[PDB]
Amino acid sequence: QQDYETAKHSQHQAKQQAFALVEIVQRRVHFSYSDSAGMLSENADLNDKLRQRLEHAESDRSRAREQLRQQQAQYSQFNQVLASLKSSYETKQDMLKEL
């Protein structure tokens, strides 16, 4: 029982640490607001910096677009090959039934 309460506390430690890490993962984009923090500090016309950040985001967005396109192509390829295996196994099972 003593070791059990000890383990409970250790579980609590793991829980808190994991919860923190999760929170940061949620705030993952917020760290991208360091530019927003710097941008806000301008306290004057800053549409130039806005446009710069926008261009950087556009580049990243297109990069992710290609990432997604190739990824979905790969996934679809795997899907067709899996389906081909499915159909082939069905057919083979059928010829086995017949024989």
């Binding site: 579980q11 609590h12 829980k15 808190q16 919860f19 549409n47």
Partner: protein
């Protein structure tokens, strides 16, 4: 011989099906390209409208003079006053409310974590229960838990 004939018939039917499905798939692919082209066209129309609107407003909005700035503070205060049931909520007393609701929030997190610990042990218990059940089903097939 007869078996070969049957399979030849089957191959004919499969060829017809493949032809038809290839037709449908080519139709679907060209429709997908169509809808792509259309969607990118709409995207570019949207981007054009946004960019040209930005161009038009350029000289309008640069000269803020930090004088329309505080209104954002006004809307934030009102949003909090609605979200937080504190009609008395004022920027002067907002600090006590901040520390208080932070205390409640961390308290809720701790209660949530205790709930999570108990939940995370009960769930794994259930998981072993279900894994045993699946093993039973695989080996013998359908059966109720009480039979397990």
């Amino acid at each position: 011989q007869e078996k070969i004939d049957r399979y030849q018939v089957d191959l004919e039917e499969l060829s017809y099906r493949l032809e038809e499905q290839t037709d449908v798939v080519e139709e679907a692919g060209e429709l997908q390209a169509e809808y792509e082209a259309r969607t990118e066209a709409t995207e570019q129309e949207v981007d054009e409208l946004k960019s040209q609107l930005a161009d038009y407003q350029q000289a309008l909005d640069v000269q803020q003079t930090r004088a329309i700035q505080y209104q954002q503070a006004l809307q934030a205060l009102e949003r909090a006053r609605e979200l937080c049931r504190l009609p008395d909520l004022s920027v002067d007393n907002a600090e006590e409310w901040l520390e208080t609701f932070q205390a409640k929030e961390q308290q809720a997190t701790e209660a949530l974590l205790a709930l999570e610990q108990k939940l995370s042990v009960a769930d794994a218990a259930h998981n072993q229960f279900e894994q045993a059940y699946q093993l039973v089903k695989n080996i013998v097939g359908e059966t109720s838990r009480s039979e397990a």
